[PDB]
Design a binder for this molecule. Structure first.
Ligand SMILES: *[C@@H]1O[C@H](CO)[C@@H](O[C@@H]2O[C@H](CO)[C@@H](O)[C@H](O)[C@H]2NC(C)=O)[C@H](O)[C@H]1NC(C)=O
Ligand code: NI
Lengths: 110, 100
């Protein structure tokens, strides 16, 4: 089989700071599961993530490498990418863009 | 055309650039990501890139009184400086040194 990452071009999500949320990077493989990581884009560099962290959920013919936001903070705004090392090669996914609304400082007047 | 800092143009749409130390082997689609490939020995790329071939490593010929102040790696170019007891006589950086 061919390894590949299935994030759609211009993927975006709109979520509330304060709620929990997961991003799911769909990974295709068959033989050995590849080492996957997530990173947030800050311009030129994609800085890797490790503090509030990741996990796998495996489905029939496609698995999901999951970045957990527990809860989502206001500063979690921005673009995110997963990368997969398989047999020395590297697959760079389309980024997905989180638009977090700061519920604390957001007010309905009505 | 309108690609973000981390994306590059292929066809009429944008695409994820490869990491430093890697070149583009196969281009993205609408749903699929960009396949990247390690730079061969003696080549490098220093930044996020959509290059299908890596750049050549700078050489530091000892016959020109040059020692490598830093080696070439896949992610970094080699930078030539002068060898023990030598001073620069040709300039971006030094390309030749004479002895004292
Ligand atoms: C660049 O790499 C060369 C080769 O790996 C280094 O030169 C070696 O230095 C080590 C000591 O650390 C010795 O074991 C070898 O005999 C040296 N090899 C040769 C042919 O010179 C060099 O020091 C490195 N320079 C830097 C700063 O990265
Ligand atoms: Ni509202």
């Amino acid at each position: 089989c061919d390894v590949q990452l299935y994030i759609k071009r211009q993927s975006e999500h709109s979520i509330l700071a304060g709620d929990p949320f997961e991003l799911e990077c769909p990974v295709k493989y068959c033989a050995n599961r590849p080492h996957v990581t997530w990173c947030k884009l800050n311009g030129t560099t994609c800085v890797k993530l490790e503090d509030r962290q990741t996990s796998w959920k495996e489905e029939k013919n496609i698995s999901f490498f999951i970045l957990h936001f527990e809860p989502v903070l206001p500063n979690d705004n921005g673009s995110y990418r997963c990368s997969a090392n398989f047999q020395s090669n590297l697959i760079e996914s389309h980024s997905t863009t989180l638009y977090v609304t700061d519920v604390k400082h957001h007010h309905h007047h009505h | 055309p309108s690609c973000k800092e981390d994306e590059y143009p292929v066809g009429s749409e944008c695409c994820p650039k490869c990491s430093p130390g890697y070149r583009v082997k196969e281009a993205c689609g609408e749903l699929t990501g960009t396949v990247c490939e390690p730079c061969p020995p003696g080549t490098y790329i220093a930044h996020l890139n959509g290059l299908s071939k890596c750049l050549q490593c700078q050489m530091c010929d000892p016959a020109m009184g040059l020692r490598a102040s830093r080696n070439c790696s896949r992610t970094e170019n080699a930078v030539c400086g002068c060898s023990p007891g030598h001073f620069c006589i040709v300039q971006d950086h030094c390309a030749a040194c004479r002895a004292y």
